[PDB]
Amino acid sequence: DVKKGILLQLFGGTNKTFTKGGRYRGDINILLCGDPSTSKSQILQYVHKITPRGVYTSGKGSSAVGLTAYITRDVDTKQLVLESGALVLSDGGVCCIDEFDKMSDSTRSVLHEVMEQQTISIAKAGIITTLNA
């Protein structure tokens, strides 16, 4: 019953785009629960190797900055650049996150907009831009 749901996540429903209507998220958000040591971490390592744009992150290892877009700088021009995160580089694949219950409160609030409108709106340092994810 668990493998039957992950198989549909790789395929997923179509994206019926509308011109005068809102965008509906067609992805399948699956959450695994139960006791650990039950081949839970092995599933996240197999979907990443199949998806060409899949990533693998942890709970405490990535806060609300590593998943969004960290404001990095170029080592050639010394300018404020915008680098993509774990949720932006996976434009079209499945994101595998380990230890979902060990995340901070500032990181769980950002995923509320990604699982609804599939958009990440960041308004920091006077830069209010909406990133698609």
Partner: protein, 435 residues
């Protein structure tokens, strides 16, 4: 020769020293798998095999300044060798390393055992808990003062690849330091996502931590999970969980005081029944056994499954008791396989026998029986009337009648080995009480 130097290798770069009007080196010619099979080294390995009892000799040669703890030193010998890394063709890499954790009161020479295994292993890095945070344990993203490029400096879990990682004070660690530990004990990788560097570094190390109780000494009135400030998720990944309790005893303290005074006097170990093995020759025997990959036998597969059922049944009945340990997780089943495969490498055998499975299961029962006392009583040699009563229970199971005419039970007693005179006295005794 370009595109052939990997960061983290130990090679002999041969070139010329030419200055630059800065001094550079023009490259001209460029681990356990780098040691060649020299005829002189192979002769020293065969000298220890023909001597007999190689498993008990190397188990007592480690830590010559620590007396006692024979079962604790046996697990440290398999940590230097380890199991096999069976790579499945589908894409699964089974971890062959062993996860051993030492616990108990801080007085069983915990700091000496961690430093003894570090000098023996060629790629061992010793570290603490509070002194090494999340930056020193994983990888530090520093800036290059020349090319101005963000490199990845190796810390404790990176420089100790294919070795043994010694971690001291596992209970005094922070919450941000256990992030990379959960990934090494599962996938042997380190997920780094800092300074725009989203790369994964391999970490095939052997974590050997040493936890300490929160209240200093151990409390038998409290649960083992509440006495140690460690969650149940970390105990499931560890294969062996020792517990060296400092029990005051007049016999153990007398033998320990004599061993300490002998070391601080002659600067050597007391004379036993065998010669101590030098650390220069011990590294040749471990590296030679790592090349041999033993295969599990088919007759020993039935004993592993039957042992997991008896181990899971005993842990389920002790869930409401005072010594409530961890649940029978599937990770504990794979730990016995890795311990049995590592025991076959020391005997230079390509097949796992039944003796390797019983020896691996004994180390797990010892670490689990450290809380119980040494008071074991067993008696089962009463009158032979109880053995005859078992034959009567077989007739009642198929039928269930308490008649006086018994003509079929007499034929079963004769086939066993008992006489007919003692059988008549047992039937009359049970017939008086109507059984």
């Amino acid at each position: 020769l370009v595109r052939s130097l990997s960061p983290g290798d130990i090679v002999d770069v041969t070139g010329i020293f030419l200055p630059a009007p800065e001094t550079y080196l023009e490259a001209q010619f460029v681990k356990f798998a780098s040691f060649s099979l020299t005829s002189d080294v192979e002769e020293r390995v065969m000298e220890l095999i023909t001597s007999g009892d190689v498993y008990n000799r190397l188990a007592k040669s480690i830590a010559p300044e620590i007396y006692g703890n024979l079962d604790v030193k046996k697990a440290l010998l398999l940590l230097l060798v380890g199991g096999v890394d069976k790579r499945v063709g589908d894409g699964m890499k089974i971890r062959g390393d062993i996860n051993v954790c030492l616990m108990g009161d801080p007085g069983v020479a915990k700091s000496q055992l961690l430093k003894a295994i570090c000098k023996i292993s060629p790629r061992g890095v010793y570290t603490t808990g509070k002194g090494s945070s999340g930056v020193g344990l994983t990888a530090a993203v520093m800036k290059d003062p020349v090319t101005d490029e963000m490199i990845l400096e190796g810390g404790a879990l990176v420089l100790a690849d294919n070795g043994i990682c010694c971690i001291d004070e596992f209970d005094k660690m922070d919450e941000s330091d256990r992030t990379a530990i959960h990934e090494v004990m599962e996938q042997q990788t380190i997920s780094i996502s800092k300074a725009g560097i989203n790369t994964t570094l391999n970490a095939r190390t052997s974590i050997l931590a040493a936890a300490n109780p929160l209240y200093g000494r151990y409390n038998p009135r409290l649960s083992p999970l509440d006495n140690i400030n460690l969650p149940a998720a970390l105990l499931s990944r560890f294969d062996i969980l020792f517990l060296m309790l400092d029990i005051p005893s007049r016999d153990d303290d007398e033998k320990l005081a004599e061993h300490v005074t002998y070391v601080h006097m002659h600067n050597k170990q007391p004379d036993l029944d065998f010669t101590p093995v030098e650390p220069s020759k011990m590294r040749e025997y471990i590296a030679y056994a790592k090349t041999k990959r033993p295969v599990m036998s088919e007759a020993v597969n039935d004993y592993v499954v039957q042992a997991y059922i008896r181990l899971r049944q005993d842990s389920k009945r002790e869930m409401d008791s005072k010594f409530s340990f961890g649940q029978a997780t599937p990770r504990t089943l794979l730990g016995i396989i890795r311990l049995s495969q590592a025991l076959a490498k020391l005997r230079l055998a390509d097949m796992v026998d039944i003796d390797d499975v019983e020896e691996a299961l004994r180390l797990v029962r010892v670490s689990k029986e450290s809380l119980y006392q040494e008071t074991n009583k067993s008696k089962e040699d009463e009158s032979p009337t109880t053995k005859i009563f078992t034959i009567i229970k077989k007739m009642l199971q198929e039928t269930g009648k308490n008649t006086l005419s018994y003509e079929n039970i007499v034929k079963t007693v004769r086939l066993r080995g008992f006489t007919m005179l003692q059988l008549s006295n047992c039937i009359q005794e049970y017939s008086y009480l109507n059984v």
